[PDB]
Symmetry: C3
């Protein structure tokens, strides 16, 4: 059967541009680039089986990878419960030019538990629906050709304690449609026997230093790594190292620092050598930027970018699409939300309990958007004491649930470490699965000192981390203040507006405050923003407005769920949002 | 001299069948079978030196390996204190067919500290008297032949804090003769440079899956493992994996499940490949079975085998022999105790503070006997509060003693992991060396979730693990009950009966209750078992009778110490023991 | 310019003997000797730059390696603050006979953080100013010749929390000039591809055993180590091992035991084989000695050397030099302090919050001096409760400061493990940076049980470790006694005497007591020593007199700061010091 978008829900303009022969063709890993790769997106054979059932060899339907089974653009649009498993199967060829090289199989993200076979040979497994993973499949490849790839996915959604974000089995209110299966690009990559697996890039503008650690799959004493840094196409600095040492690149003192108003990116060329012969080399980019906090001349702790106080103001971006759920239909659509955030005068985005594909963060690096990265929530909740420092009963996770949280949080910080845009880690949000807050905040800060730590966005509040985060709806309000840290407003606004022919369901829509016209909503937004501007001088050092787009029945975004309508006046919002981003400028 | 059993104590009928040129010739590791091996059992040169003394080159007497120095069948029958060391010396030849192959020197068990030299070259060491260990002795061999094997053993018995079980220096009451030296078969094994060191087999009947993890001595990327599962001679399942991934084998949903009444075993054939070349291959077996606890329709937590409630009923088996102490004289003697347990209508055996050779657990796998595996006890004790939840002073082990416990307990669970018969781990018994009970129980359940955890058989009791274990003598009694877990009777009975021609000592013999004839003793057993049967509906979910055989002056077993007389009527006991084993049947 | 000692301060007689083309030429590592090496001491190019500044390629001045930048013998004599970095640069040729071999670059000690480049290739980094470290620089060597070596050094002194000893930015009273940069010999060494990195030598006189673990850089199964022990020229013991096992060498029962009165040293010859091919070979020494504590017949816990009670009595040696600061000008000078200690009748030396070069400890092994090794102090302090057991507020180190302490304390014990002279580890002194005393003392004893543990010299006092250490000035006093351990006097005396023309500064000189002639000071020393002798049978088991030499304004040593005048009468001191060392003789 011919592939068709499933369901009768609203769809973006990119839904009718989807070509099942060329689905999401852009390079999946701009932070470490090799020239050769093969995209495995497209139409795979799929099957939904009972958990523990036979993996079938004859399939009746097809799914469009990488769109989740519940999504419209998958061409399937079915539900998978905690007692079912999804089976992807496709054939693939290895290019003849790749002969003799190691072949890596890459997954951007699969929710939740993945088991992969190549020609009936198990090549690897993975748990965690937000992090990328790879397997070396060269021993399993066939000399004849027609390699068979089988992926077995399990996802209990909210019936299990794993990180899931807004995914629930019964969507209502603030909770959305579950996301199961392959939802990021799958691709093959040829590499040498010894190759760079990851680039750990860390800047230090105070020491005029750029550190690049090339993590290899295997090490030898004669290994040699060389890093070349380019301003445009002019080489401005270089570094070499052996013995697995991180490459310290001495940067020029007049280096161009990265910021939202001037997001300059240097270009990196990293080379690996066994002795004096080149075995591997990759392309990358880097930015000289610094995140910190410092008490200003008025006694208030501010968030600082490049040793200068900067008020961070941005929308809450949950990253949902009506046709692709977690997956943006095209690369132009993925970029669209970020560009509209710049067009609204913001300098920040809070990616809410979700991790995006690698291309999204690179776009924030290129466009100049500071990113607050949440840790996707899950499991049960303690009591939410949202307006005072927590004194209630601490919730105890099972040893298994705690292990999953710690494991996936480390993997998220690991795979997102080299991105300049990320400035703040947010381990918890509104007591969702919150546990051992002080211990996790200290571990997060100790693991990556270059970023700020938001211990719990909106509670539960503990005297730890780098900032106190208050939520309040609808208007901004400073009901709690930590003079020892920065005090921010991690969620406010939520002005709702129901624009028919552009909503997910005909009724039960809601906002924190509701109006019947775009003008009335823009007036209420400017009113809230005017209050927020006067509060910067009184204690608030950052703020997050809810939200970027409408999501399902929550119609309180700057754009409709299908992105076809901008709900608030852009020129009026840009005028005051710009004033707030420059509120601390000298 | 000529070899001759030492001492005038009672002996089993197999003591006169011992041939010192063919001592214990059966394959020592049925769970992982290669074809070629060489048995080093037999007459070694021995010497008892002062601790720290010089290792002599000339020797006066010989010892029969593998019988402990204190045992009768060793031909020595001498005592070794904590200020002495035992020195074994032996010459061995390597078969010419093994040329080019790696040669592994295997020890089944040596108590307690072992140091091994091959041609005056130290090849390894080991601490722990109950676990197997191996050394690669290939570089120490000589081309001229006549390799010299020297083993130095030290055993402080109860003068040290290490696990020892029932071994003491001054045997009396419930404490038996010390066991020092080599008490399990020593053998050689030829293997490839890369070979399978251990098979970690784990079933999952709920997911119709058999996971086989082949742990290798070295790993390369092109390593390939293939597992073939056979129902008799018919291949019914297969699995392949690379990258060190454990082999998940999809079992048929009609898979024959293992149980004491139907102990079916599948045959495994595991093959290791370096690329396309077969480099190693082993034979094994597996059983599809599951242990768990579930609350029944009456509100009582029951032990469940294969998702069905099953009452587990069996004898306490300390595994002691009058002539070989820890070592059964022949393989037919080792099997006899298990066979007589089956004949008395039991379905379970509690191996009491001892670990048996590998062939013993395989016999339980083949005959169909669930095994409760104790952790051999040692060190000092806290106060034993046997009838209430513990409230006294916790005992504090030294850092060295706790490390010895944690290490050997991990090693025991490691080498015994793949055995279907084992269903329950018992870290402590009657407060013998009991410390950090809750922490040890949680670590045990986390390290192997496929088995049940009995935190402390008979006390001290803590609200942890999978069951509450009461001891009571002589009659059964339910004086304490945990409605949140299963409640079991891990020790009861102990009906004594002195037979003149088949006891260890002339007097000082004892039972918990004593009768003068087999008829009277069987009357009391059927009396206690009738009480136990009614208590099954009342709360009890498992029970252990004391004991399998008489041991030294404790004459309360089903058989005499020398195994020549069955003390209780088998036909009357089997009829009621079978009724108790089927008590929870629906 | 041409090299010349800087400053107008007093200098030793060896300052005028320094030849800049032959500086400290003796072999830097007697505990593990290979024949071939190249000394890199001499005149390097140097530059003091801003922290984070450019590393120059052209230099204006030169420094005499290995003398610290602040020292006189460096030819520089300048101060480096925490916002500055020191840059060393020199060229070096690799001898042609070293071709094909691996070339290691050895640093004895650099304070505090070190980064090393060879031909602009980073070869390694290191933090910690008291431990040696090595780099394999072979892939960075150039075939043309004239290799360039660049060493960047950063040292915050007391502006950071790292271990620093007596170094402060503003020397006054008991605190002395900072020591920044390379202060121990830099040298090159050729080794085979597989070589012995370090020798872990541990004796056991109770088991007549010497254990030698040859720690290699890489491991193979075919590896083979042989250890030959020589009494003079006569081979008296040998041992061989494979599989990485430590070599157990059976020592003769009449072995010559090491002691201050008879410091016999056996000679070691360690050989590493790959199969039957010798690939590496090192020479070493070893001593059969044992440190312990036992309660004597009078109920007092004494320090025991070789299972016999021995009163350890020695001076406090801070190891400071007016011309070389931390670095002794010549090897003849490094020996002089130890020789005068022996000439004064002592048998022990407390190396105060400093780690000396390896030759210094070998000289203690050869001359017969027991060493109490302090952990160099740093960071902030809690309240010093010096006369009672601590009940005040515990000080909380930062996560970074605690890590630096634990890391360097392990590295100090690791590199000093094989030295016979070292008998006691002292983690803290007078509450300087004291934290988690009980945990650190238990970790220290568990890491090296062969040495005694002084938990905190002079406080803060906790019921832990092997001894209680009291400080009292000027006279001895036993205000606190621990009957469960030994009670020692780790600091007393401090008799001051100002000898003009031999002092650091003309003003602010001080002692704990001040006298005007050598006669008066010697009278007071014998008076304090007479008190100490009577106190031996009262509970004191060891004592430390302050101090070896004058250091800057603290003029209370046995010698002047320039080692030119013996301030106290040697014959009278030797007569009483010898009586105190033999006080526990039976
Ligand atoms: Cl091609
Ligand atoms: Cl290929
Ligand atoms: Cl490298
Ligand atoms: Cl509240
Ligand atoms: Cl006997
Ligand atoms: Cl061979
Ligand atoms: Cl594998
Ligand atoms: Cl090693
Ligand atoms: Cl070795
Ligand atoms: Mg999901
Ligand atoms: Mg024993
Ligand atoms: Mg310093």
């Amino acid at each position: 059967a011919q592939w068709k978008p499933a369901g009768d829900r609203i769809k973006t303009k990119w839904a009718e541009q989807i070509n099942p022969s060329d689905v999401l063709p852009e390079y999946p890993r701009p932070i470490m680039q090799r020239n050769d790769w093969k995209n495995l997106n497209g139409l795979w054979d799929y099957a939904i089986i009972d958990k523990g059932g036979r993996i079938p060899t004859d399939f009746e339907g097809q799914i469009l990878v990488p769109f989740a089974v519940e999504s419209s653009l998958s061409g399937v649009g079915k539900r998978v419960n905690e007692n079912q498993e999804v089976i992807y199967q496709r054939s693939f060829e290895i290019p003849s030019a790749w002969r003799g090289k190691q072949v890596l199989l890459h997954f951007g993200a699969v929710d939740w538990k993945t088991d992969v076979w190549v020609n009936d040979i198990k090549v690897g497994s993975h748990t965690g629906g937000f992090t990328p993973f790879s397997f070396d499949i060269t021993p399993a490849l066939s000399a004849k050709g027609n390699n068979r790839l089988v992926v077995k996915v399990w996802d209990p959604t909210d019936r299990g304690p794993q990180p899931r974000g807004k995914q629930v089995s019964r969507p209502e209110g603030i909770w959305y449609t579950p996301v199961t299966g392959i939802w990021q690009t799958v691709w093959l990559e040829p590499v040498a026997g010894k190759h760079i697996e990851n680039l750990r890039i860390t800047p230090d503008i105070d020491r005029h230093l750029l550190t690049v650690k090339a993590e290899l799959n295997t090490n030898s004493t004669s290994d040699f790594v060389e890093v070349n840094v380019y301003d445009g196409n002019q080489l401005i600095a270089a570094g070499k190292s052996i013995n697995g040492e991180p490459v310290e690149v001495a940067m020029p003192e007049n280096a161009k620092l990265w910021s939202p108003d001037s997001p300059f990116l240097y270009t990196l060329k990293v080379t690996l050598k066994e002795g004096n012969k080149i075995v591997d080399k990759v392309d990358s980019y880097a930015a000289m930027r610094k995140y910190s906090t410092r008490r200003d001349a008025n006694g208030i702790v501010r968030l600082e970018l490049n040793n200068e106080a900067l008020f961070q103001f941005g929308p809450l971006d949950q990253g949902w699409w009506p046709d692709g759920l977690y997956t943006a239909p095209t690369d132009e659509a993925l970029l669209y939300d970020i560009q509209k955030t710049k067009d609204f005068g913001y300098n920040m985005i809070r990616k809410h309990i979700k991790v995006e594909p690698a291309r999204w963060y690179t776009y924030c690096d290129q466009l100049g958007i500071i990113v607050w990265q949440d840790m996707p929530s899950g499991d049960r909740n303690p009591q939410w004491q949202n307006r005072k420092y927590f004194d209630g009963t601490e919730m105890k996770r099972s040893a298994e649930s705690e292990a999953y949280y710690r494991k996936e949080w480390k993997e998220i910080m690991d795979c997102l470490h080299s991105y300049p845009c990320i400035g703040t880690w947010v381990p918890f949000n509104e007591a969702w699965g919150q546990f051992k807050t002080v211990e996790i905040a200290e571990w997060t800060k100790q693991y990556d000192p270059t970023r700020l730590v938001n211990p719990a966005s909106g509670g539960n509040h503990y005297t730890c981390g780098d900032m106190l985060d208050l939520h309040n709806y609808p208007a901004p309000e400073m009901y709690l203040y930590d003079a020892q840290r920065a005090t921010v407003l991690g969620e406010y606004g939520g002005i709702g507006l129901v624009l028919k022919d552009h909503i997910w369901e005909p009724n039960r829509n809601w906002g924190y405050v509701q109006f019947n016209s775009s003008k009335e909503a823009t007036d209420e937004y400017v009113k809230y923003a005017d209050m927020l501007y006067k509060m910067v001088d009184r204690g608030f050092s950052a703020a997050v407005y809810t939200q970027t787009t409408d999501v399902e029945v929550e119609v309180n975004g700057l754009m409709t769920y299908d992105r076809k309508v901008i709900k608030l006046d852009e020129k009026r919002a840009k005028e005051i949002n710009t004033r707030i981003c420059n509120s601390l400028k000298k």
